[PDB]
Amino acid sequence: XXXXXXXXXXXXXXXXXXXXXXXXXXPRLAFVGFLGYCSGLIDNAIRRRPVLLAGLHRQLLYITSFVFVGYYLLKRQDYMYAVRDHDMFSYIKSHXXXXXXXXXXXXXXXXXXX
Amino acid sequence: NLMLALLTNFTLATLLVIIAFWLPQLFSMKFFLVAITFLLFDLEIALLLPLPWASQTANLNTMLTMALFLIILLAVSLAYEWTQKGLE
Amino acid sequence: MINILMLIIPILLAVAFLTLVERKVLGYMQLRKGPNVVGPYGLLQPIADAIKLFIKEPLRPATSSASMFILAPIMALGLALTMWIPLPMPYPLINMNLGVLFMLAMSSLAVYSILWSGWASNSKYALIGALRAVAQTISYEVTLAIILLSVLLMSGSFTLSTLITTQEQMWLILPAWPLAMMWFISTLAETNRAPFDLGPFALFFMAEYANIIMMNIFTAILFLGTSHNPHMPELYTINFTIKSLLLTMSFLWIRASYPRFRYDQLMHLLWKNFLPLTLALCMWHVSLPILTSGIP
Amino acid sequence: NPIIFIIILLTIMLGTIIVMISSHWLLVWIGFEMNMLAIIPIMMKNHNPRATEASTKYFLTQSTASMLLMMAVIINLMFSGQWTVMKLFNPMASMLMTMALAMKLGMAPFHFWVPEVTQGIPLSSGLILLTWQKLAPMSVLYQIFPSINLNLILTLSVLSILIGGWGGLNQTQLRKIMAYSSIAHMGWMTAVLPYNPTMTLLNLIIYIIMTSTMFTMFMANSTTTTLSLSHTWNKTPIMTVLILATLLSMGGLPPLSGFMPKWMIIQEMTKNNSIILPTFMAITALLNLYFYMRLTYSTTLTMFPSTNNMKMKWQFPLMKKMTFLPTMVVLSTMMLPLTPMLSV
Amino acid sequence: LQAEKDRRVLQMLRENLEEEATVMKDXXXXXXXXXXXXXXXXXXXXXXXXXXXXXXXXXXXXXXXXXXX
Amino acid sequence: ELPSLEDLKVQEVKVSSSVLKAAAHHYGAQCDKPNKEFMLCRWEEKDPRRCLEEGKLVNQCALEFFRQIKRHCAEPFTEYWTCIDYSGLQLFRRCRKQQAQFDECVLDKXXXXXXXXXXXXXXXXXXXXXXXXXXXXXXXXXXXXXXXXXXXXXXXXXXXXXXX
Amino acid sequence: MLYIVFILSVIFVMGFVGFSSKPSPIYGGLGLIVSGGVGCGIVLNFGGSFLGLMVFLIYLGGMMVVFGYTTAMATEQYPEIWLSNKAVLGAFVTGLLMEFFMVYYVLKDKEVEVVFEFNGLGDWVIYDTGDSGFFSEEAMGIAALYSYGTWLVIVTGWSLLIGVVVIMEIT
Amino acid sequence: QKRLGVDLDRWMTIQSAEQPHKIPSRCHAFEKEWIECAHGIGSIRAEKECKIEFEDFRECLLRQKTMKRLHAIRRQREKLIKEGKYTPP
Amino acid sequence: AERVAAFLKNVWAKEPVLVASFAIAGLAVILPTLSPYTKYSLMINXXXXXXXXXXXXXXXXXXXXXXXXXXXXXXXXXXX
Amino acid sequence: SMVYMNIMMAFTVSLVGLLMYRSHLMSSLLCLEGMMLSLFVMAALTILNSHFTLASMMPIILLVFAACEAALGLSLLVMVSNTYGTDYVQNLNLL
C-alpha cells in the first residue's frame, strides 16, 4: 500500500509496529558495508593520496556511516514488505468471494509435431 | 451614491482644461534602488494594516508575538540598507 | 444630491483666496506688504489671477503626445477634489465603509500627476528632474502609512467619524507626542516646497495648494478635536475652522523660515533616521492596547 | 557573497519544505515563489552578459508558468469549493494544472528554456540547484496523481524522450548535454505517475544523486567537450574513471545503479496491460545513451589534447558529497532490489 | 430575526403563484421537491430569488455597499 | 418544496419604526421565555418551517411589552425616543441625562429591570417540543466504515522482486 | 439601471485589450489604471471594505508607480501614437471583437459560450447573498487575522527579507 | 502531503472550520455533508456512495441548477408579450 | 565597564536618534510580559460577544439560570 | 455564473499578452501585473459570495506575492539596459 490507512504518517522508522526483528549480520548488510569500504578507496582518487588501500585511516567513518544508515534503511524494507503482505492476506479473508480454488484435472492439450 | 460623487469631480476637472485650450484665438540607475524599497516596505505595511480593525475578537497573547515580528524584520531589511547603500 | 457642488465651488474659491494668505502672512514674515493696490486689502487679486491665466493665456506645447499633457491636470485636480468626500467634518458626504484607507489611496494615486507631466516633455533634460520630484513624494508615503496606523491602533477603526468621538476630553497630541511632530514634516513632502522643491500649468497650482488645505484638515482630525456636540452643529463648525487655520500658518512658516534640505540629505532625514524612529514608535503602539485595555 | 549567501541558499531548502508539508493550495504557491526569489541571485553571482540573458529567460518562462497554477487553484474555489491538495476534481482545472507542471517537469512542449538557462550559469554550484529544484514540483504531482486525465500527461512523457534523445546530439557544450539529459530523464518521471505512485520518488533519488555527482566531477573547470577532453593526460587520470562510471550509469546499463529505476517503470506499466508504450520508452532510451557514449570517449580514447601548459599543484575543490555518493551511483544493483518499498 | 423569516415565506408564496400562472400549457415543469436533490435542510434560496418582479425594490435590497444610506 | 400556508403566522407584524426597539434593552429581561425557546428550537433544527409555531408567540409577546409602556409612564418613553433619533447612532452617548427620567417611572411598577453587564448565555428549557436531536441533512452513512484487520504481520517470507 | 456589476465588467475587459496588443509601455501602462480603478467596483459591490481598497493602495498606488520608474529607466523612446503602428491596430480590433460579439448574445437572456457553463440573466441572483450576519458582519468584514494562520505570517516576512537582500546584490 | 505534520498544527485550510468569528459559511449546511461522507478511506477513492451528497454541495457554490430554473421562468415571462401575464407586485 | 559605559555616551554623541530606535522598540517587548496588567485586557476581549448567544437545553446543569439578573455563570464585572 | 464569464475572458487576453512579443520587453511584466489583477478579482468574488471568513486572508497574501515577482523580475529588466543600450527581446545572444 502506498497511502497510509492504519500506519502512522511520518515515522522515524515505524514505532507503531516494532515486532519484526531486524536481520543480524545479513549478506545484504555486508554488501552495503562493502560499498562503505569502496567509498573509502575512491576518495583517494579524487584527492591524490598515496595508496587507496593503505592510506588514510578516516575510512572507518565511511564504513560506519553506510552500516548505520543501511541498518535503518533495511529495517524499513522488512517493515514495508510485511505490511504489503498483511493487507494482502486480510483482503482474501474478509471478502472470500474474490478468490477461487481449483485442484485436480484431466484436460486435453494440443500436441506439437516435429 | 459613490458613483455620482466621483464622476462630478472628474467632469468639472475636464471642463477646466477646455477653457484654456479652446477659447483664445489670434540615465542614473541609483534612483531605481529607492523605488524598489518603497514597494517591498509597503507590502509589510499591507500585512501590518489590519491591526486596529483586526484585534477585536482574536486572542491577544497569540497576536502580540506575531504582530511585533513583522516590524522586527522590517527593521532587519533596513539594517541591510546600512551596509553600504550608496551615495544616495 | 446638491451638496457635492457645495464642496467643489467654495473649495476652488479657498484655493483661489489662498493667494492672499500665501504672500501677505508670508509677507509680514519677510516685513513686506503683500496685496494692497488691487482691492481694499487685495481681495480682488485672487479672482483676477483666474481671468489672467484661464481665458487669455495661450498654449505652446513641447510635443503634445495625443492624450497626455491634456490628461495630467485632470488627474491632478480630480484626485485633489475627491479627497474632500471621505472627510468626516460635522457630517460627511457619502460616508465610506472605511475612512482613512480611502484617504491614503487617493494620495498615493496623486503621485501620477507629477509622473505624466514628466512624460509630456520629449526632452531628457526635464524627466531626470521629474523623477527626482517623484522620489520626494514616494518615499514619505511609506512612513505616512506607519504613523497613521499607530494613531488608529490607539483608538478607533479606519472610519473617520469614530476619530471625532474618541477625542472627547483630551487631544491626541499628548499621547502621540513624537508622532505629532512627524505630521508637521511628512505632509510637506507632497509638493509644498518647504523642505524640498523641484493654462494647464496654472491648473497644477489649483491642485497643489488644494492638498495643502487637505493635509491641514486631516491633521486637525487625527490630533485635534476638543468637542463633538451632536445637538449643536453651530459650535463645531466655527471651532474646527480656527484649528485648521492655525495649521495653515505653520505650513507657510516652513516655506519662509527654513532653507531646502538637499535631495540627498532628504534621504538622510527619512529612511536613515526617520524610518528607525517611526517603527520604534509603531512597536510601542502595538503594545499599548495590550498593556492597558484600549480596543474600539 | 559572504555569510548571507548561505541564508539565500537556506531559503531554497526551506522553500521546498513548505511544498513538502502542505494542505493548502495557496501555501505551495508561496513555496514555489520562495524558490523564485532565491535562485535568481545565484544565477547571477558574478554578473555577466550571458548571466543577465539566462536569468531573465529563467524568470519569464517560470513566473508565467506558476501563474497558470494559480488559475487551477481558483477553479478549485469555483468548482468543488474546498482548499485541499488531495484531488483536482474538475477536468477543466486539470488541463491548466498539468500544463503548469509540464512547464517545470513534463518539458515535452516546454523544454526551450532549459539548454539556454543551464549554459548561462557562470558557476558549477548553480548547476546543482537546477537539478535539485525539480524535487519541488514532484511533491505536488505525488499528491494529485488521481483525477488528472492520462491522455495529456503521457504525451508529455513520450514526446520528451524524443526531443531529449535528439536535442543533445548537436551539442558540444557540457552544460547543454546535461540540460537535455534532464528532459530525457523527465520522461521516465512523468510515466510512473499514472502507473503506481511508488518508485516515481525513487526515480528522483537515483537521478538527483547521479546528477549531483556529475557536476561535482566538473569542479575542475570544464564547459565544453574539448575542455573535458584535456583531463586524462594533462590532469588527474584516476578522476576520469569515476566520470566514466557515472556516465555509463546515466544510460540504461544493468551492472550499474541507473538501470534499477528502469526496472520498475516498465514492470508496473506491463502490469496495467500496456506493451506498446513501454516498447517506445526502451528504443528512445538508446538515443539518451549516445550523448554519454561520445562523452566517455574523452575518458577512454587518446583524442590528443596534451597542451603546453601543465599542472603540478594538487587540486582542492569544494566536494560536499563527491566521494560517498558516486559509490552508490556506480554500484547499487545488488544493494537495492527491495529498497523500492523503503522510499514510499 | 423573525422579521427576516416572515418576509422569506411571503416572498416565496408570491413566486409560487407566478410559477403556476406562467407554466400551464407547453412546459412540463411541476415545481415539486425543490431544486435540491437531498431536500432535507433547504438553504437560503431567496437570496438569489427575492422575486424577479419590480426592479426598484430589488436594486435596494441586493446592493448595500453601493450608495450606503 | 412544500411551503407554508398563505395565512402564515402573526397578525399585524412589528410595532412601528426602527431605533424605538433598539432604545429599550428591557426587552431582554421582560418576556424571555418565548424568545429563548424559539432560539433553542432554531439552532437544533435549522428549518424555519418547523419552529414557526414558537415564533408566533414571539410576535404576540412583543405587542404585550410595548402596550404596558404606553399605558403607564408614556411621557418619559416618548422623550427618550426623540433623543435617540435626533442623533446618529450613538444610542447611549449624549442621551444619558434624558435616560435618568426613564427607568425611574418604570421603577414604580415591577417592569423595571437593569441588564447591568451582560447575558453571559443563559440556559433554560421547559417546552422542548419533540426533543429534536438528530435531523441535519444526511440520510445515509454511505458504505459505512472501511474493512481493516489488525493481527500484526510476522515476517512475510520472500520478497516480491526477482533478486531474493 | 438594472445591472451594477455587469457594466463594470465590460470596462474591465476594455482596458485589458492594450496588453494582448502592443501599444508601448506608456499607453499599455495607462490600461492598468483604467482596468484597476473600475476593477475595484467589481470587488466592492458584493462587499469587502478592506480588500476592495487594497487594490487602490498596492496594485494602483504602489505596483504601477514603481513601473512608472522603470519605463524611464529602460525603454522610454519618447511616447508615440498607438494607431500608426502595423499589426497593433489589428490586434486591438480582434481583441475587442472577441468580447463585444458576446455582448450582443446577452440579449434574449442565453448566450453562446466556449465553456460548458451557461450564463442566463442573473441580475438579482448576481449577488446571491442574504443578510445573515449583522454585528461584525461579512466574511470579508474580518478578513485578516494573525491568529490561526500563524505559519503564513512567518513565511511572508521571510520572503520580504529575501527581496531587499537579493535586489541589492544584483546591482 | 508527501511529508505530514506532527505535533504542531498549521492548517485552517478546508471548508467548515473554526471560523475567525462566530459567523458561519454560506454553504456550511452542505459543507458538513461532504466531510461526513468522505471521512472514511473507502468513499472518495470509490466515489460512488458520495455522489448524491457532492451534487447538492455543487448546487450551493455554483448555483447552476437554480440558474437554469430561473432562466425558464424569466424567458416565459418575456414570451407573454401582448398576452395574459400575471402581475401583482 | 567595557561595553555598557563606553558604548553609551558615544551613541548619544554620534547618531543620537539611533538610541531611541533600540530603547523604545526594545521596551515594547519587555513590558507586556513582566507588568501585571495584560491579563485583565484579554478577559474583556473574550467577554464582549460579537454574535447572539446560544441557548442550551437544561438537563442537570450548574451555574445556569434564566435571562433575568441572577447569580449564574461568570459574567464580567471587573473594575466598575 | 455571470460575472465570472467576463473576467475569465479578461484572463485569456492577459494570458496571450504574456505569450506575445514584438520588440519591447516591458509588456510582459505589465501583463504579469494584469494576470495577477485578473486572478485577484476571481479569488475575491468566490470568497465574498460564498462566505469563508478564514479564507478571505488568502487573496491578501496573494496580493503581497504578486508584487514580489513583479519587482525581483523587474530588477532584472534594468540589468539588461546596463549591458545593452535598450531592452529588446530581439536582442539576445544565447543559442
Any domain includes B24: yes
Grouping H, G, I as helix, E, B as strand and the rest as coil, residue G148 is coil
The alpha carbon dihedral of D265, D271, D276, D279 has a sign of: positive
DSSP-assigned letter for residue G107? S
Using a CB-CB cut-off of 8 Å, the residues of chain E touching B2 are 66-68
Domain map (residue ranges) of chain G: 3-168
Rounded CA separation I31/I33 (Å): 6
CB G22 within 8 A of CB G28: yes
Rounded CA separation E3/F59 (Å): 9
Burial degree of C19 (CB within 10 A; 0-12, 13-18, 19+): buried
What is the residue whose three cell numbers read 586524462?
D232
Beta-bridge partners for D224: D173
Contacts of A57 (CB under 8 A, 6+ apart): none
Grouping H, G, I as helix, E, B as strand and the rest as coil, residue G102 is helix
Chain H interface includes B57 (CB < 8 A): yes
Rounded CA separation G159/H11 (Å): 20
Which residues of chain H approach chain J closer than 8 Å at the C-beta?
A: 12, 15, 17, 19-21, 23-27, 60-64, 67
Hey, are the CB atoms on A10 and H3 less than 8 Å from each other? Answer: yes
Beta-bridge partners for D173: D224
What is the residue whose three cell numbers read 437572456?
G109
Task: List the CATH number of the domain containing B31.
Answer: 1.20.58.1610
Query: In this complex, which chains have at least 3 CB pairs below 8 Å with chain A?
Result: D, F, H
Question: Measured between CA atoms, how close is C162 to chain I, in angstroms?
Answer: 19
Question: Which residues 81-110 on chain G approach chain J with CB closer than 8 angstroms?
Answer: 87-88, 91, 95, 98-99, 102
Hey, are the CB atoms on H6 and A5 less than 8 Å from each other? Answer: no
The beta-carbon neighbor of G124 closest among E44, E48, E66 is E48
Using a CB-CB cut-off of 8 Å, the residues of chain D touching G115 are 92
> One-letter amino acid identity for E46?
X
CB D18 within 8 A of CB J65: no
Rounded CA separation B16/C55 (Å): 10
Rounded CA separation D163/J62 (Å): 36
> One-letter amino acid identity for A113?
X
Rounded CA separation D142/D181 (Å): 22
Contacts of J27 (CB under 8 A, 6+ apart): G19, G22, G25, G28, J17, J20, J21
Burial degree of C192 (CB within 10 A; 0-12, 13-18, 19+): buried
For chain J, how many residues are written?
Answer: 95
Ramachandran region, residue C98 (left: φ > 0; alpha: ψ -120 to 50; beta: rest): beta
In chain G, whose CA is at the least distance from the CA of D51?
A: G170
The closest alpha carbon to C106, from C139, C134, C76, C83, belongs to C83
> One-letter amino acid identity for E59?
X
SS3 track for H30-66: HHHHHHHHCCCHHHHCCCCCCHHHHHHHHHHHCCHHH
For chain I, the first-to-last Cα distance in angstroms comes to 50
Interface test with F, best of D338, D339, D342 (most F CBs within 10 A): D338
CB G58 within 8 A of CB J67: yes
What is the residue whose three cell numbers read 516435429?
A114
Rounded CA separation F77/F92 (Å): 15
Chain J interface includes B46 (CB < 8 A): yes
DSSP-assigned letter for residue D324? T
CB C152 within 8 A of CB B56: no
Using a CB-CB cut-off of 8 Å, the residues of chain H touching A90 are none
Chain F interface includes C95 (CB < 8 A): no
Q: Vertex C24, ends C22 and C30: CA angle to 5°?
A: 100
Question: Measured between CA atoms, how close is J11 to chain B, in angstroms?
Answer: 24
The closest alpha carbon to J57, from F56, D254, G149, D143, belongs to G149
Hey, are the CB atoms on B36 and J71 less than 8 Å from each other? Answer: yes
> One-letter amino acid identity for H34?
W
Hey, are the CB atoms on E21 and H66 less than 8 Å from each other? Answer: no
The closest alpha carbon to J32, from D151, D62, C131, belongs to D62
Hey, are the CB atoms on J36 and D67 less than 8 Å from each other? Answer: yes
CA D218 from centre of chain: 17
Hey, are the CB atoms on G56 and C109 less than 8 Å from each other? Answer: yes
CB D108 within 8 A of CB D155: yes
Grouping H, G, I as helix, E, B as strand and the rest as coil, residue D260 is helix
Enter the C-alpha cell of residue C149.
496606523
Question: Measured between CA atoms, how close is D134 to chain F, in angstroms?
Answer: 28
For chain H, the first-to-last Cα distance in angstroms comes to 55
CA D215 from centre of chain: 12
Using a CB-CB cut-off of 8 Å, the residues of chain I touching H21 are 50-51
Q: What is the DSSP string of J35-72?
A: HHHHHHHHHHHHHHHS--SSGGGHHHHHHHHHHHHHHH
Any domain includes B35: yes
Rounded CA separation H82/J11 (Å): 43
CB J35 within 8 A of CB G35: no
CA C18 from centre of chain: 14
* Count of domains for chain B: 1
Using a CB-CB cut-off of 8 Å, the residues of chain G touching E65 are 44-47
> One-letter amino acid identity for G141?
G
CA D230 from centre of chain: 27
Using a CB-CB cut-off of 8 Å, the residues of chain H touching J50 are 25-27, 60-61
CB H75 within 8 A of CB H59: no
For chain C, the first-to-last Cα distance in angstroms comes to 32
Rounded CA separation A104/C105 (Å): 88
In chain J, whose CA is at the least distance from the CA of B31?
A: J78
Resolution in Å, one decimal place: 4.3
CB G33 within 8 A of CB C75: no
CA atoms in the 13 A half-sphere facing the CB of D182: 30
What is the residue whose three cell numbers read 591524490?
A48
CB C55 within 8 A of CB C48: no
Question: Measured between CA atoms, how close is C119 to chain G, in angstroms?
Answer: 8
Q: Between B and H, how many CB-CB pairs are < 8 A?
A: 3
SS3 track for chain C: CCCCHHHCHHHHHHHHCHHHHHHHHHHHHCCCCCCCCCCCCCCCHHHHHHHHHHHHCCCCCCCCCCCCCCCHHHHHHHHHHHCCCCCCCCCCCCCCCCCHHHHHHHHHCCCHHHHHHHHHCCCHHHHHHHHHHHHHHHCHHHHHHHHHHHHHHHCCCCCCCHHHHCCCCCCCCCCCHHHHHHHHHHHHHCCCCCCCCCCHHHHHHHHHHHHHHHHHHHHHHHCCCCCCCCCCHHHHHHHHHHHHHHHHHHHHHHHHHCCCCCHHHHHHHCCCCHHHHHHHHHHHHHHHHHHCCCCC
CATH architecture of G3-168: Up-down Bundle (1.20)
Using a CB-CB cut-off of 8 Å, the residues of chain H touching G121 are 70-71, 74
Contacts of D272 (CB under 8 A, 6+ apart): D195
Hey, are the CB atoms on G57 and C101 less than 8 Å from each other? Answer: yes
Residues D88/D91/D92/D94 CA torsion (nearest 10 deg): 50
CB D48 within 8 A of CB D15: no
Grouping H, G, I as helix, E, B as strand and the rest as coil, residue D224 is strand
Contacts of F69 (CB under 8 A, 6+ apart): F24, F77, F106, F111
Grouping H, G, I as helix, E, B as strand and the rest as coil, residue D173 is strand
H14-20's contacts with Cβ under 8 Å and 24+ in sequence apart are: H14/D23, H14/D82, H14/D83, H14/D84, H15/D81, H15/D82, H15/D83, H15/J52, H17/J54, H18/G148, H19/J53, H19/J54, H20/B57, H20/B58, H20/G142, H20/G145, H20/G147, H20/G148, H20/J53, H20/J54
CB G140 within 8 A of CB J48: yes
The beta-carbon neighbor of J67 closest among B29, B32, B43 is B43
Q: What angle separates helix G64-73 from helix C124-138, to the nearest 10 degrees?
A: 150
Residues B63/B68/B74/B77 CA torsion (nearest 10 deg): -110
In chain B, whose CA is at the least distance from the CA of I28?
A: B68
CB A89 within 8 A of CB F157: no
Grouping H, G, I as helix, E, B as strand and the rest as coil, residue J26 is helix
Rounded CA separation C128/C263 (Å): 13
Rounded CA separation J69/J62 (Å): 11
Ramachandran region, residue F156 (left: φ > 0; alpha: ψ -120 to 50; beta: rest): left
Hey, are the CB atoms on B64 and I32 less than 8 Å from each other? Answer: yes
The closest alpha carbon to F103, from F16, F15, F29, belongs to F29
The alpha carbon dihedral of H34, H38, H43, H45 has a sign of: positive
Rounded CA separation H32/H6 (Å): 25
Rounded CA separation H23/J56 (Å): 13
Experimental method: cryo-EM
φ/ψ of A103, rounded to 5, equals: -150, 145
Q: In which domain, by residue range, is B31 found?
A: 6-83
In chain G, whose CA is at the least distance from the CA of B67?
A: G146
Rounded CA separation D66/D15 (Å): 15
Chain G interface includes J49 (CB < 8 A): yes
Question: Which residues 34-63 on chain J approach chain B with CB closer than 8 angstroms?
Answer: 60, 63
Which residues of chain H approach chain E closer than 8 Å at the C-beta?
A: 26-27, 29-30, 33, 52-53, 55-56, 59-60, 63, 65-66, 69-70, 72-74, 76-77, 80, 86-89
Q: What is the DSSP string of F8-56?
A: -S-SS---SSSSHHHH--TTTTSS-HHHHHHHHHHHHS--TTTSHHHHH
E26-38 burial: b if 16+ Cβ within 10 Å, else e: eeeeeeeebbbeb
Rounded CA separation G58/C135 (Å): 17
Rounded CA separation G168/G171 (Å): 6
Interface test with B, best of J36, J62, J64 (most B CBs within 10 A): J64
Domains of chain J: 2-84 (1.10.287.3510)
Radius of gyration of chain H measured on its C-alpha atoms: 21
Grouping H, G, I as helix, E, B as strand and the rest as coil, residue D214 is helix
CA atoms in the 13 A half-sphere facing the CB of C135: 27
Chain G interface includes E41 (CB < 8 A): no
Rounded CA separation C21/C18 (Å): 5
Using a CB-CB cut-off of 8 Å, the residues of chain E touching B1 are 66-67
Hey, are the CB atoms on E63 and G127 less than 8 Å from each other? Answer: yes
Q: What is the DSSP string of A70-113?
A: HHHHHHHHHHHHHHHHHHHHHHHHHH-SS-----------PPPP
Residues C10/C11/C14/C15 CA torsion (nearest 10 deg): -140
Ramachandran region, residue F149 (left: φ > 0; alpha: ψ -120 to 50; beta: rest): beta
Question: Measured between CA atoms, how close is F152 to chain H, in angstroms?
Answer: 21
Cα distances (Å, whole numbers) of residue D264 to A87, A98, D271, H48: 21, 27, 10, 31
For chain G, the first-to-last Cα distance in angstroms comes to 54
CA atoms in the 13 A half-sphere facing the CB of G156: 32
The closest alpha carbon to C284, from H62, B74, I27, belongs to I27
φ/ψ of A100, rounded to 5, equals: -130, 145
CA atoms in the 13 A half-sphere facing the CB of C68: 25
Contacts of D135 (CB under 8 A, 6+ apart): D16, D204, D208
Rounded CA separation D259/D282 (Å): 12
Grouping H, G, I as helix, E, B as strand and the rest as coil, residue J78 is helix
Burial degree of D304 (CB within 10 A; 0-12, 13-18, 19+): exposed
> One-letter amino acid identity for D99?
M
SS3 track for A33-48: HHHHHHHHHHHHHHCC
Rounded CA separation B19/C62 (Å): 20
For chain C, how many residues are written?
Answer: 296
Grouping H, G, I as helix, E, B as strand and the rest as coil, residue G55 is helix
The closest alpha carbon to E66, from B6, B2, G56, belongs to B2
CB C211 within 8 A of CB C246: no
Rounded CA separation C192/A38 (Å): 77
Rounded CA separation J49/C74 (Å): 35
Query: In this complex, which chains have at least 3 CB pairs below 8 Å with chain E?
Result: B, C, F, G, H
